[PDB]
Design a protein around this nucleic acid. Structure first.
Length: 1176
DNA sequence: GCTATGAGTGGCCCCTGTGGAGAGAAGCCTGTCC
DNA sequence: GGGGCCACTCATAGC
RNA sequence: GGACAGGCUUCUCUCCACAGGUUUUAGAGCUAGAAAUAGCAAGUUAAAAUAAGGCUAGUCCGUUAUCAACUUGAAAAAGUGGCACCGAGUCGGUGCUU
């Protein structure tokens, strides 16, 4: 008798529940064979459990770091090119100069040439540093002076300019000598410069340096006169935030101003210093974060001026001037991609010739057009119905016609005397299109009634059905082409359809003017110069969903018509796109079926990866599938009858749906009208322009920045910045409310912090005005008020985010269809899939209601059994709905079961080698060198490697000064950086670490969260080489859970008042349960936790607060289970008492433990005794 | 009489800010079809 | 959030 | 249940760039004092690296994803574990079979 059974499943981002039930809703228990060398040959367990694993992580960090690596490599390349140019002349004056520069980072002892880099001797080096305190002084000297300087100084200037060439955010040239705004923008870049020089930036920096010196001297004198006691603190203590820290220490400028402001108020004669302090300009450094606004053209001008001045003495400079200028100016275009030779998975460049690509010959080697085409196409989707065909651009003329005709396909018109609404003829539709769609960018119902029915067809009153106040489709591309070309018959000619489609595709693909001009040069014979130039400026983005071959490429074998041909006119049928593709009277459906490529199916891994979502949900799907397969294997390979899955999606109010559906432009108009401001009056704007986030945020700001009281400029939004109210490190939120447009320097000044208190105070009134305007969300107000609320907190950083609930939805039906594919595969006599297994979807509301109605509450903070219980309830509810005392008793018995299978999936750690910060030199063996030849003692380096996994080693170690051999048995941690060498040859790596006579056969691969068992059932999981985590699970009787739930929401119960009072009475009567809960926690702790100090602290705190109100008792006790929870220990707050985490910092006890390897469900076990291995 | 050492406990530390270009998916809301 | 690290203290083992 | 059409919201992938920060070294510290130390002077810049490196030698690649254990496998992958009943503190006992 094949016992009928069903499987229930719950899927989350971190948990996967599984449950097996019979038709009587009982959970069967089976005896399972146990492998290994232990005595326990057979173990009985129940068929219920849940799997826990680490969350998946996105690739954003990897992409960012790859981009950074590429930037560093290319910058090094540019420096190498400059050195290549200079080598011939530099060798004649100083052969060792470049070696001195290259090895300058090394200590004195390891340097081969003389220690002073610039001149190799003390006198000239000192003289140079005295004459030129900053490199910008040297730059100005070279720009203005007309005398021949040393070549080495010229090299330093050129290299410094190249290595910090600045941004390319502005196109074209920005040299004032349109001129008025040019000079204004230059004054914006650099402020106040009286003398006319070709290097204004250097003059500005020198002026800043001199202001620094004068203010430093004045402050020194004032402090020494008035505050003698605090002089040493300000000028000697590097640990504080004073001037010493601002210079020698890591103190930021903001902290320096914060530390220095109160002292300035305490002294006289500090007025101007305070005024400059209000402008963030006192004692300001030169190399600062404000320089990010400097355009590269300024450095280009300075470079060109210096080269022009010195080219009269060194001919090679004059010959190579253009090369040097291009080195600064050249960059690889974004559509080109990396210049890889085929060996890179991220690259797509097509190379014309096998020469080495250089900045001087880039044009001759790289096919810009083909590269751009490949870049655009490889990310677009293929047509679903025609897999081998690319989709058309969303602005295609043919696609727009298709949309218009499809919308007009089902329009029904009712006139006087007509009994039923009527379909439009092909002639009628063509006339309507010609009369209105080619004349108006948007067509409304009123416009149609006035212009076509009443004027042309002469119908006085007409009733229109199926269209609401306007037709969705619009011929905007046609209007733009009519505006530009101004030749209507050229647009109307069908022989130009190929040419027009090619034009539209060209305009969609490319954004560089040069490429567009190059491609249109073939068609320049048909249009004048002005028309050709105008077309170069039009741009389109986006793509459609159907291919040209689908709409007007394939023809019906019987009539010769395409789908578009049918849509234009099909007689009384008036069949739409869906009807035509589902029409059995045409060959189109046969073409669809034939085009279905029965190609090599994606593997389970690949099929899961091809879904759209976070890779975490992909990992969840893969784990669920393997769980299902193993469960099927357990029951004798008999397929289950039913599978139940759960999603936690919660529906939303409709009126919110329509108010979102309203275009943002209308709601901005309403907000401005409530305000009454004239910003839209001065600058009217259209919704498709609001489609860009930049201009939309600018309008939301109403031209006024939240952070600084300053007027935004419409033409400067590109240079402007948007910064998140909450930094990305604390929490990731790209929502519009978190996004706020801000002045650039103000943004870059405020980093990794919430807005400061005083800015909030000064802009609070304006923020309330905005909130009354409703242009701002209350959530964004909450973000702006974090300083009042207390800033960032640990609790807000980690929590169950809403985004996981989004990840759960229809990706859950995706895993459902994946299971459907495998479970039902047999085809019947008619080649129809035989659905032997049903896929069931139920919403979490049903199960939550079942729980609330029948007192089966769940409290997540107690243990991990809740996932398994939810899966069991899902299965029960699904089976019941497709299909009382005995069932309810069975449910209560199941929910009270003490044995539940909880398994933590073992994972090999990967990722970064260690912490990214570099620490100063010190005498410790735990530092790792940044380079092969750089001694960590003399150079410092990285710290705290992340252990990939641990291995058990039995060998002998030469210990003591006597070098005597001693048999040892311990855990050795393999770093990720050493993983390759260890896996290449374990024996060699172990010998290198100092182990001798290693028994290779005893090596056991122990990944993270590996499980060990001890006496009395105490369990531990291997967290790393030297730290463990709690591995046991607390089983609590259900009545205590129910009592705790009731007490927790004592004043928050959601039920009938009589039921609320009954539950209150039940809570009052069973108050003695609290002591039982405490005693059970105490017993569990004394047995498996071993936290005697923490347990005594908790117990003492309990009796002290024994008289507190019951609800607070419940809130505190629920927090108390964090002591006994699975995983790493965590700190928690019990009333006002704080308990530190108890960390198990020694792993010696598990060397004599019983190692357990658990299957993906844990039903199979393999136990190995470690006491018998490596016996002394 | 001195030293090496294992063992534990308490507290602190964790690289960052952005600009531009494109593509895609998924939730809702309206209308039409299978 | 959580593993790593260092200063500090003590208790014991061996000589 | 699915697809196209219009509006809004949220997130994912790829590329091109900028500004920093950190680290070592160079920028003769002076005076009195054996030294401990005290006083004074100065403080802004610079070079190089920015995951160890790898061979496929590119102006490329190196932090995503995958993985219980045993056998066959380079890997992917394939195979490897009785049942029924009475019970229940992390699972026990009871009866048949290999």
């Amino acid at each position: 008798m094949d016992k009928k059974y069903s499987i229930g499943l719950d899927i989350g981002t971190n948990s996967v529940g599984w449950a097996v039930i019979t038709d009587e809703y009982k959970v069967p228990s089976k005896k399972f064979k146990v492998l290994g060398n232990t005595d326990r040959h057979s173990i009985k367990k129940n068929l219920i459990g849940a799997l826990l694993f680490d969350s998946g992580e996105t690739a954003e960090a990897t992409r960012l770091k790859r981009t950074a690596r590429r930037r560093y490599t290319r910058r090094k390349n540019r420096i190498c090119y400059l050195q290549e140019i200079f080598s011939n002349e530099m060798a004649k004056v100083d052969d060792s100069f470049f070696h001195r520069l290259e090895e300058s980072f090394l200590v004195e002892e390891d340097k081969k040439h003389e220690r002073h880099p610039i001149f190799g001797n003390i006198v000239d080096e000192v003289a140079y540093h005295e004459k030129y305190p900053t490199i910008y002084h040297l730059r100005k000297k070279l720009v203005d002076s007309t005398d021949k300087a040393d070549l080495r100084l010229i090299y330093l200037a050129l290299a410094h300019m190249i290595k910090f060439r600045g941004h390319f955010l502005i196109e074209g040239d920005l040299n004032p000598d349109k001129n008025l705004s040019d000079a204004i923008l230059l004054s914006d870049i650099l402020r106040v410069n009286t003398e006319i020089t070709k290097a204004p930036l250097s003059a500005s920096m020198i002026k800043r340096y001199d202001e620094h010196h004068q203010d430093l001297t004045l402050l020194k004198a004032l402090v020494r006169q008035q505050l003698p006691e605090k002089y040493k603190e300000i000028f000697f203590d590097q640990s504080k935030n004073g001037y010493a820290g601002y210079i020698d220490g890591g103190a930021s400028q903001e902290e320096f101003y914060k530390f220095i402001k109160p002292i300035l108020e305490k002294m006289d004669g500090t007025e101007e210093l305070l005024v400059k302090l209000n402008r963030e300009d006192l004692l300001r450094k030169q190399r600062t974060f404000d320089n990010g606004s400097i355009p590269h053209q300024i450095h280009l001008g300075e470079l060109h001026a210096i080269l022009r001045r010195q080219e009269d003495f060194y001919p090679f400079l004059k010959d190579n001037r253009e090369k040097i200028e291009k080195i600064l100016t050249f960059r690889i275009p974004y559509y080109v991609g990396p210049l890889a030779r085929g060996n890179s998975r991220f690259a797509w460049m097509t190379r014309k010739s096998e020469e080495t690509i250089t900045p001087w010959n880039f044009e001759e080697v790289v096919d810009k057009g083909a590269s751009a085409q490949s870049f655009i196409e490889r990310m677009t989707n293929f047509d679903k119905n025609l897999p081998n065909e690319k989709v058309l651009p969303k602005h295609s003329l043919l696609y727009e016609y298709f949309t218009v005709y499809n919308e007009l396909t089902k329009v029904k018109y009712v006139t006087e005397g007509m009994r039923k609404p009527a379909f439009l003829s092909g002639e009628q539709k063509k006339a309507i299109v010609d009369l209105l769609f080619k004349t108006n960018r948007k067509v409304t119902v009123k416009q149609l009634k006035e212009d076509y029915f009443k004027k042309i067809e002469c119908f006085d009153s007409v009733e229109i059905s199926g269209v609401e106040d306007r037709f969705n489709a619009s011929l905007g591309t046609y209007h733009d082409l009519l505006k530009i070309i101004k030749d209507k018959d050229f647009l109307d000619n069908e022989e130009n359809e190929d040419i027009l489609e090619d034009i539209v595709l060209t305009l969609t693909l490319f954004e560089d003017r040069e490429m567009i001009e190059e491609r249109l040069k073939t068609y320049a014979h048909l249009f004048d110069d002005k028309v050709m130039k105008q077309l170069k400026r039009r741009r389109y983005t986006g793509w459609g969903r159907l291919s040209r071959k689908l709409i007007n490429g394939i023809r019906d074998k019987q009539s010769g018509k395409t789908i578009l041909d049918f849509l234009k006119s099909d007689g009384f049928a008036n069949r739409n796109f869906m009807q035509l593709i589902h029409d059995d009277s045409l060959t189109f459906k046969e073409d669809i079926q034939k085009a279905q490529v029965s190609g090599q199916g994606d593997s389970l891994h690949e099929h899961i990866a091809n879904l759209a979502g976070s890779p975490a949900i992909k990992k969840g799907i893969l784990q669920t599938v393997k769980v299902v397969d193993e469960l099927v294997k357990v029951m004798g390979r008999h397929k289950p009858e039913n599978i139940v899955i759960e999603m936690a999606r919660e529906n939303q109010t409709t009126q919110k749906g329509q108010k979102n559906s309203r275009e943002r432009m209308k709601r901005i108009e309403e907000g401005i009208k409530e305000l009454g401001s004239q910003i839209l009056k001065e600058h009217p704007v259209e919704n498709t322009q609001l489609q860009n986030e930049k201009l939309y945020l600018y309008y939301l700001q109403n031209g006024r920045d939240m952070y600084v009281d300053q007027e935004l400029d419409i033409n400067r939004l590109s240079d402007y910045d948007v910064d998140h109210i909450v930094p990305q490190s604390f929490l990731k939120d790209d929502s519009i409310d978190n996004k706020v447009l801000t002045r650039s320097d103000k943004n870059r000044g405020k980093s990794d912090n919430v807005p400061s208190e005083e800015v909030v105070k000064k802009m609070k009134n304006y923020w309330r005005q905005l909130l009354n305007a409703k242009l701002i969300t209350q959530r964004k107000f909450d973000n702006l008020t974090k300083a009042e609320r207390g800033g960032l907190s640990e609790l807000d950083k980690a929590g169950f985010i809403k985004r996981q609930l989004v990840e759960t939805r229809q990706i859950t039906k995706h895993v459902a269809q994946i299971l459907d594919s495998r479970m039902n595969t047999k085809y019947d006599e008619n080649d129809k899939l035989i659905r032997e297994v049903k896929v069931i979807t139920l919403k979490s509301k049903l199960v939550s209601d079942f729980r609330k109605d029948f007192q089966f509450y769940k409290v997540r903070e107690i243990n991990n059994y809740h996932h398994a219980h939810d899966a069991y309830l899902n299965a029960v509810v699904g089976t019941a709905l497709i299909k009382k005392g005995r069932d309810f008793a069975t449910v209560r018995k199941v929910l009270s079961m003490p044995q539940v299978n909880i398994v933590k999936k073992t994972e090999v750690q990967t990722g970064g080698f260690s912490k990214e910060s570099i620490l100063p030199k010190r005498n410790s063996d735990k530092l790792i060198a940044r380079k092969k030849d750089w001694d960590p003692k003399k150079y410092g380096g990285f710290d705290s490697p992340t252990v990939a996994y641990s291995v058990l080693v039995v060998a002998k170690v030469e210990k003591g000064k006597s070098k005597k051999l001693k048999s040892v048995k311990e855990l050795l941690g393999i770093t990720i950086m050493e993983r390759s060498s260890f896996e290449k040859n374990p024996i060699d790596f172990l010998e290198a670490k100092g182990y001798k006579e290693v028994k290779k056969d005893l090596i056991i691969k122990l990944p993270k969260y590996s499980l060990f068992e001890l006496e009395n059932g105490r369990k531990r999981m291997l967290a790393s080489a030297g730290e463990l985590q709690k591995g046991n699970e607390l089983a609590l009787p259900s009545k205590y859970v129910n009592f705790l739930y009731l007490a927790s929401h004592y004043e928050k119960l959601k039920g009938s008042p009589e039921d609320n009072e009954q539950k209150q009475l039940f809570v009052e009567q069973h108050k003695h349960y609290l002591d039982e809960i405490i005693e059970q926690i105490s017993e569990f702790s004394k047995r498996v936790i071993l936290a005697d100090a923490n347990l005594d602290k908790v117990l003492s705190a309990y009796n002290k607060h024994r008289d507190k109100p019951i609800r607070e008792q419940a809130e505190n006790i629920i927090h108390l289970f964090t002591l006994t929870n699975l995983g790493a220990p965590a700190a928690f707050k019990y009333f006002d008492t704080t308990i530190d985490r108890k960390r198990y910092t020694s792993t010696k006890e598990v060397l004599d433990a019983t190692l357990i390897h658990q299957s993906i469900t844990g039903l199979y076990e393999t136990r190995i005794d470690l006491s018998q291995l490596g016996g002394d």
